Amino acid sequence: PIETVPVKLKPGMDGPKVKQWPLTEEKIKALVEICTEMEKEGKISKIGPENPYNTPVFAIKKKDSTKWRKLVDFRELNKRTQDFWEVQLGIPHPAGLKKKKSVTVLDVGDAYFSVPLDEDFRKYTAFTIPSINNETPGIRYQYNVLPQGWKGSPAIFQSSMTKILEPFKKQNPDIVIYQYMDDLYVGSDLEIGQHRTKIEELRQHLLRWGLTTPGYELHPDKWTVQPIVLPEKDSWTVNDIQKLVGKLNWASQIYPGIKVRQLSKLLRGTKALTEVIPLTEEAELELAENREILKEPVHGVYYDPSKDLIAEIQKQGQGQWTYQIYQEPFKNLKTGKYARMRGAHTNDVKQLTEAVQKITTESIVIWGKTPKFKLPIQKETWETWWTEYWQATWIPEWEFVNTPPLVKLWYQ
Template sequence: MKGTECPTPPLRWLVDRPIWENHWPLPHDKLVTLRELVQEQLDQGHLEPSTSPWNTPVFCIKKKSGKWRLLQDLRKINAVMEGMGTLQAGMPSPTMLPVDWPVLIVDLKDCFFTIPLHPDDRPKFAFTVPTINNAEPAQRYQWRVLPQGMWNSPMLCQWYVACALSGVHKQFPDAHVYHYMDDILVATPTQDELLRIQPQLLNALHSHGLQVAPEKVQQQPPWKYLRVKILEQKIRHQEVQFVQSVKTLNDAQKLVGVITWLRPYLGLTTAQLSPLFELLKGVTDLKSPRELTPEAQKVLEEVQPAVSARQVYRIEPSIDVTVFITTPDLHPTGIIGQWNDDWTDPLHVLEWVFLPHQPHKTATALFELIARLIIKCRQRCLQLMGVDPSKIILPVQREEFDWSYVNNVSLQSALEGFSGQITYHLPSHKLLQVAKNIQFSL
């Protein structure tokens, strides 16, 4: 096991006294399986013998595939471990990949099991393989690699892989290198450049002990990445199966969570999804009863085909990025996109932006919502590109905007420091028609 070039930082602990939780008795068949799984990890160098004063139970479960998985109950260990924070606030957006740039995607194999745990922390993750009737001394082991279920394992995984990739970033500064957990994407202006970077990338990973899954190296479109399909110019979501049976608030939250995650790609407006949002209201107990109303069922029927039919685009670097503000059903909606009259479809949507679901607002309060949406769109552009959009197009008349700007502190704050262009006429496009006839009461 390698990893000397990026030594894993030590964990910080809230207690000095060891934690010992006795192992659980296991039936004979599971005990045999547990011993086999432990031997596999020993053979691969993931475990080592232990005499640690720390101990937490281990067990094994059968996955849907029929294979067995070794698990350790680390709840008490996690409770006395200091959190390391978050390195990535979210996933990288593939819409920022320049159009037609060739792409290489690499998946790391068993990422946690290839990253060394700091030697000082290994004794904290010790466990015991029990024996029946205490017939012999139990065998004890501790992890040498990041344990599954350890609170800080995801953060340490991100940190370690980023360290391994740091040399690639420096050597190829013009390449786009996206890294999220065990998924790595590289894009370059030409295929020749991609061929030059590929061996350097693989060597960097291998030199740090990270293993690439050969069957998951993708070099041709469509590239599958973080549950989307990347084409030369467009990006579509992979198929998503929605929960059809909603019986509790927890079920409803999971359903709405998946759809909310899809919204930036699908353009599903707040008004469209309102029947689903209504399911979240009421008693806050996760087990409290819920059921799909006919209206909510209809929304699901509309969302499912939208996943396969709708798309967003990869960015065209030579075209300015514009924020289009629309107001479908008085729910302001933003589009971060690009416009070019020479394109077959002149509007290339990079991402949809929405405000949180809230009750119907009057026209008087609409500029307050537009101001919040402008802030959210500008913040998202900074996250995606590091710069403001070049233009913001509002669905209002110039005189309405001027009056509101003078009298509305929220609108002034939303546009503070904006040096781009503000215009007041949405171009003709089916995705922008929803705002054409809105009249504002001032």
């Protein structure tokens, strides 16, 4: 018996009608045991064929957790509620959250089930629990309360949240708190000991206000940027000078002051790839002068809030992956490298799933926005397995790309 903030699909578009993808018996079980319980609690309740809307759902275990979390893919709804969240209520992004020596991510999504949801909107939370082999038809529900993972839910709960938090924020003014969907990012420069204590401390503030919380730590001050680097060579084979020249030629789309002229001239005749040609000083100095232009920043690269972020990931082999975040080509906001992620040396799809998450996470701590991925994978492979390795409560946007490697040169 409290008010309910009405919600509307931005003009012209209908509710999400998207199909439920097949689930494992494992996961279908977890949803059944999860939904019957959420029904008993009147969080969701059964629905009929008069409601022709569907959003996909599946289940996950969070990292280092043996407990099953339900997950709805509200991506399509969030696109169709979008004007509502972006234009109506803004959430200021702390530029310092990224500078903190430690940042913990707490899962607060459960609190959202407190607030009721506007009855006219509920027909848009429809999701099917599928059956193995189509033996039964689907068990269909819709959300009565604020659904986890919808973009309106953290918005409408914005007010209620800011309330419960003000004591801690007031008592601890030096601690930074951000909220992105079902997740709460909390970070501080306190030594981890007093930090972990302050997080438990933060846990009570919401624990006693009626919330549950199923390590979480990040270390943003330590986040490194992978700069472009030309190899260190004693003696150069023709092939070396060439791979070098080509790479430099690529880099110059990014850094315009690059010149290949004297390094280029070194290759003049028709010579064996493996013959060793010595570096003239005039080129040797141009190359080293090039190595310089490559420790710098790039004129006019800055984050622009209105534009979407784009992330490109490359498989470098032997467990390594490189990525780049940018909103416009060749103007990169961050570049990096990953190695020895889970699955390294055994499962590429696992590693990339891991990769997409680590990238999405930094993307949220830094600009407070999830990127759109260009995934180096065939559609169906990713689409078939990505759901097994997924440990996150959000779902970034992605498209599939194939590039035979000339862009691999991000890493030696």
